[PDB]
Design an enzyme around this catalytic site. Sequence first.
Site, PDB file in Angstrom:
ATOM      1  N   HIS A  66       0.835  -1.199   0.000  1.00 43.74           N
ATOM      2  CA  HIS A  66       0.000   0.000   0.000  1.00 43.74           C
ATOM      3  C   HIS A  66       0.863   1.241   0.000  1.00 43.74           C
ATOM      4  O   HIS A  66       1.959   1.262   0.549  1.00 43.74           O
ATOM      5  CB  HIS A  66      -0.977   0.041   1.180  1.00 43.74           C
TER       6      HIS A  66
ATOM      7  N   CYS B 114      -0.253  -0.033  -4.461  1.00 42.52           N
ATOM      8  CA  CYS B 114      -1.691  -0.017  -4.560  1.00 42.52           C
ATOM      9  C   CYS B 114      -2.057   1.337  -3.931  1.00 42.52           C
ATOM     10  O   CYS B 114      -2.067   1.457  -2.701  1.00 42.52           O
ATOM     11  CB  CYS B 114      -2.282  -1.176  -3.771  1.00 42.52           C
TER      12      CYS B 114
END
Length: 351
Positions: A78, A127
């Site tokens: 992330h 992401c």
Amino acid sequence: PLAKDKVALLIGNMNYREHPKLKAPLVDVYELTNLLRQLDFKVVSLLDLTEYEMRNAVDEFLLLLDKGVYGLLYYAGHGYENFGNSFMVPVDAPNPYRSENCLCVQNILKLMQEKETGLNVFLLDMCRKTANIVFGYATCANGIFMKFLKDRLLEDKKITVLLDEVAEDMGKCHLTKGKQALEIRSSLSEKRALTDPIQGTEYSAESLVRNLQWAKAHELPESMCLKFDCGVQIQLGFAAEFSNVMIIYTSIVYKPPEIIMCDAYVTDFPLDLDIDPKDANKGTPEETGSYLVSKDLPKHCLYTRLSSLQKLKEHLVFTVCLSYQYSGLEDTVEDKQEVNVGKPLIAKLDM
Ligand SMILES: COC[C@H]1COCCN1c1c(NC(=O)Nc2ccc(OC)c(Cl)c2)cnc2cc(C)nn12
Ligand SMILES: [Mg+2]
């Protein structure tokens, strides 16, 4: 064009406590490690890192970026954008995010900008929410980026030309077709490639102790043969999936003919590793969360995956248990033995 040395730091975050899990970093860091090793790079591959572990890993990586060195940093997990800044999200980040608890990409880039490195490749596979730096920023079974990158990385062309070809591969792919999924920022002023050879490997005390501490930080415990009083012999084997991930596998090597059954199983691991007894001692490596080294592990064993070796602050001490039964005997005897295999892999560094 020559490299003084070639070092790589690969990080993949997937098991987030407060955020969605990701599958791709697992196979992506694994495949990127073998490919970089094929290019003669000393690699450190780390899975599921908290904030302080990332900050230690990245600082130590930057310390190796001496004059003439080729460095490659790769992150998969992330990430988020906050007013022009990009951040790498550690597995211990809270929900919602706070920038302070994440690693700022622009801060790292600034630090790389002060090095006199030969090549500095920084890949971000996130992401989403001269120093000769080549920054690659991706915002999308492998992930899209690694699927196209792994097919070109061993080409003997300039890394910028190579990454530009990957950008064109991704632009044709029906998934990211006509989409902004890859940005390449570059200040590479000379013809450098990940395939360039390392200068005449010489006996300089400073670089030899860092090469041998990198070798030491990847040493596995040797094979073990435990003998129980009953005559049963158990073999403990050890494999490595990442710099911080070790598989332990047990098998019965010898069983006396008078013994009808013998089950060997490991337990009582140091609580820093946070090993769930329901995930240890499985009949297949896949059941433990190990899907890459499974094809190279010996078959018909009991497997336990030891992830989070970066958290081990003591000697890896655990018990090897044995349940057994003799011919005609209505009762199953139990016996145990304590094992101390030192501090394996990244745990040698004294966290
Ligand atoms: C100073 O270099 C030491 C060398 C030699 O030993 C292996 C590790 N090394 C590193 C690191 N270091 C780390 O990852 N350090 C780390 C510290 C604390 C941590 O947790 C609290 C974690 Cl998770 C990691 C990073 N990149 C590279 C690349 C190469 C070729 N080596 N290399
Ligand atoms: Mg930061």
